[PDB]
Write a protein that binds this DNA or RNA. Sequence first.
DNA 1: GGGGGAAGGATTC
DNA 2: CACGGAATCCTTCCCCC
Length: 342
Amino acid sequence: HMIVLFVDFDYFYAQVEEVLNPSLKGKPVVVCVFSGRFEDSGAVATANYEARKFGVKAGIPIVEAKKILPNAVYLPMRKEVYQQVSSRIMNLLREYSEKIEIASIDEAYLDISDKVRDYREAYNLGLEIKNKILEKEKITVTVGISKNKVFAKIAADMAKPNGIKVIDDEEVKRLIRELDIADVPGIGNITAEKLKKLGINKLVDTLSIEFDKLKGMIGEAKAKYLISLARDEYNEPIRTRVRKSIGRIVTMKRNSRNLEEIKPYLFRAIEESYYKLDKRIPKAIHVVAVTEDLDIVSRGRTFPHGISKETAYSESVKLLQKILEEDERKIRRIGVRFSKFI
DNA sequence: GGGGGAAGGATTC
DNA sequence: CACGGAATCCTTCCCCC
Ligand SMILES: Nc1nc2c(ncn2[C@H]2C[C@@H](O)[C@@H](COP(=O)(O)OP(=O)(O)OP(=O)(O)O)O2)c(=O)[nH]1
Ligand SMILES: [Ca+2]
Ligand SMILES: [Ca+2]
Ligand SMILES: [Ca+2]
């Protein structure tokens, strides 16, 4: 009987930038993360649709971006701001439901099984929310309403930007038949490829395959997940998940294997990590490194107690040494991550 | 046989 | 060319009932 409303903010980072600087509207905006290795090195965090239409999306080197739209506005990323803007919007969403699962910086699932009665009011409560967000914060969002969370997310996906969709029970049965598996939340490029080899192009194709051969390919959790959606019996609750890890990774001016060359970067990463922990004490720490060929390697340790800053500094090195010791590749990015809070 | 954690890796958004 | 934060899940190893 459950009704789920999913809210997703439009080209969020770029959009905040435009809210904070209204002149930018209508121009192509590209929020970037400058790695400083060389002039304009780094990547695209995101881009408004003005630039997205032309191929400038999250992940491309800012360099390839400048080649496509040499005259677009290129802003440095400012997480703290986007995060404080997300939060307030997120607090206005609580007015519509206590049952709210903040999935990420720009998404939230609201259980409206109560406050509403039908997709008529659902859809109207969507319009009340999309509009009340625009009023207060000046942010466009796309709403997705369906029987469960996954389908609420798909409804939003098909309706962005600034849209609102309702995939009722009629449509759900047609999506489980027509919807391209790859368009299902959780099926990225690697799981999409693996399922193709199994002849699984639709969620419905998942039913016609021995569960054991499906598990051995994508893992048990994914199988039961995809199987569940195929049978229209996926019905997971909404929970208010809490932070379980805090960390930061930075890029070096140039690759290295030298411990003293990498330290300043690792130490900076720790400082920000701690300034972010803010009152929370972690019992586990992980030094994370991206080797020059973009492979991610990491070494960590769990202590029976909380970690002080001074023990974080001392241990981080020890863990970094293990990495250079156990890997002959040059290091491109270095960072830390604190988990298992007290 | 199997609980449970810890560690390193894998994948997603 | 190619930044960055964090969650879920997998596999192997380990201790030990
Ligand atoms: N640094 C960085 N940030 C990202 C990346 N991908 C997404 N983000 C940020 C940028 C934001 O747009 C936000 C949400 O991204 P989404 O892909 O969910 O949607 P976005 O708002 O980018 O566009 P959309 O309205 O969904 O078409 O989180 C990434 O690859 N790197
Ligand atoms: Ca999103
Ligand atoms: Ca979005
Ligand atoms: Ca996909």
